[PDB]
């Protein structure tokens, strides 16, 4: 299963850097023991070589993550940005992606990694849900993601 708790959702202020975002989303994961203590460092380094910006049409989405060996227990951490922050394109495109929704993925094995990536690719095709993420409070974001994750787990 995937651990997803109320404190795995947060809104982030202006003037946050890409690294700050990674560190902020990794923080509750580290504090619950979901990831190794230097998890943020590993996500930063992997982002430098395998960028996670997704140019979907409401606003940009990023899916920062690192190797499964740095994850202790499956988890996801979500961040909503007050203003767009650039991530390099996850497909080798020249144009950077202005991102406002960040799904930090902490999956501890390959079969769960690929299954969640498939699921994410489906979720971001819902332009209206993505738009809802930009206005809902942390509670409503948590409930909506929790329900979708539980539906993923059923099957």
């Amino acid at each position: 299963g995937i651990h997803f708790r109320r404190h795995y959702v947060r809104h982030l202020p202006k003037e946050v850097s890409q690294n700050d975002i990674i560190k902020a989303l990794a923080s509750p994961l580290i504090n619950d023991g979901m990831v190794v203590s230097d998890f943020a460092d590993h996500v930063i380094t992997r982002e430098q070589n395998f960028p996670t910006g997704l140019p979907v049409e409401p606003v940009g989405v990023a899916i920062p993550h690192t190797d499964s060996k740095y994850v202790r227990q499956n988890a996801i951490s979500v961040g909503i940005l007050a203003e767009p922050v650039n991530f390099e394109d996850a497909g080798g495109e020249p144009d950077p992606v202005p991102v406002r929704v960040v799904f930090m993925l902490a999956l501890g094995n390959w079969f769960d990694i690929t299954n969640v990536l498939w699921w994410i690719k489906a979720v971001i095709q819902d332009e209206d849900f993505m738009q809802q993420l930009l206005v809902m409070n942390d509670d409503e974001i948590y409930q909506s993601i929790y329900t979708r994750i539980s539906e993923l787990e059923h099957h």
Partner: antibody
Framework: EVQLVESGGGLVKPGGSLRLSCSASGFDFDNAWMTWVRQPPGKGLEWVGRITGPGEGWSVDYAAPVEGRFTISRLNSINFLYLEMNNLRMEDSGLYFCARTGKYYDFWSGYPPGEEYFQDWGRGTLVTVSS | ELTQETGVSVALGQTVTITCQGD??????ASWYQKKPGQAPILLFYGKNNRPSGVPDRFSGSASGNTASLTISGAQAEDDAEYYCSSRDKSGSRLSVFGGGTKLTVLS
């Protein structure tokens, strides 16, 4: 850099048992997936099975013709991979290779569980089943 | 499973494409291997467009429909070898499988 060395191959009668080993060096073995592949005389490469890493609980998958007769295992402390083979058949003869196994998944075009590919190979150990 | 041509012959220096076909390829990429007698197999190409460091640029992989292709642009005498495809045996499978292999005869 990467060194893979199979051993343990030899002559065995049909119905017999054999244990193959593979020493690994030059990479992070504990987190590496490892695969056995064989090539029967005159035939092509055949996937035998693969053992995963700790995040997968070291689960193993096997090709249908060897399921139940063959057992793949690993010893992480000394970087060894093993293949134990029971009730051997003539058709089990051939060159057995161990391979360091990478995992691939393209986000935009991929389908789970992606693909496994064999990035480093040993030179093989020869198994001969004969009466 | 996965199907490859048994044998393909190519004149020295010419471009040749060998193919690998199977239903799983509609969902999964193939990887490609060269095998010479008495030598370990070598990975040539995998995924959408990944060539390992050290593999000559004249080897390229591509994919369309339920087929995967390996193209050698300007075959050398040393490219005479067995070539194998590998992928999932069925879509979404945790198992892997090789195609039957293609013997590439480069007429040198």
């Amino acid at each position: 850099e990467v060194q893979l060395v199979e051993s343990g191959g030899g002559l065995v009668k049909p119905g017999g048992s054999l244990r193959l080993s593979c020493s690994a060096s030059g990479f992070d073995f504990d987190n590496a997936w490892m695969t056995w592949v064989r090539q029967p005389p005159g035939k092509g490469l055949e996937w035998v099975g693969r053992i995963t890493g700790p995040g997968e609980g070291w689960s193993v998958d096997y090709a249908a013709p060897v399921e139940g007769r063959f057992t793949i295992s690993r010893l992480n402390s000394i970087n060894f991979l093993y293949l134990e083979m029971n009730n051997l058949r003539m058709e089990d003869s051939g060159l057995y290779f161990c391979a360091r196994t990478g995992k691939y998944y393209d986000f935009w075009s991929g389908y789970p569980p992606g693909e496994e590919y064999f990035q480093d190979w040993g030179r093989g150990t020869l198994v001969t089943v004969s009466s | 499973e996965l199907t490859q041509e048994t044998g393909v012959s190519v004149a020295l220096g010419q471009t040749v494409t060998i193919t690998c076909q199977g239903d799983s390829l509609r969902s999964h990429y193939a990887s490609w291997y060269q095998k010479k007698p008495g030598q370990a197999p070598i990975l040539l190409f995998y995924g959408k467009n990944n060539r390992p460091s050290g593999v000559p640029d004249r080897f390229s992989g591509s994919a369309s429909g339920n087929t995967a292709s390996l193209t050698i642009s300007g075959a050398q005498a040393e490219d005479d070898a067995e070539y194998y495809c590998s992928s999932r045996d069925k879509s979404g499978s945790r198992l892997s499988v090789f195609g039957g292999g293609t013997k590439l005869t480069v007429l040198s």
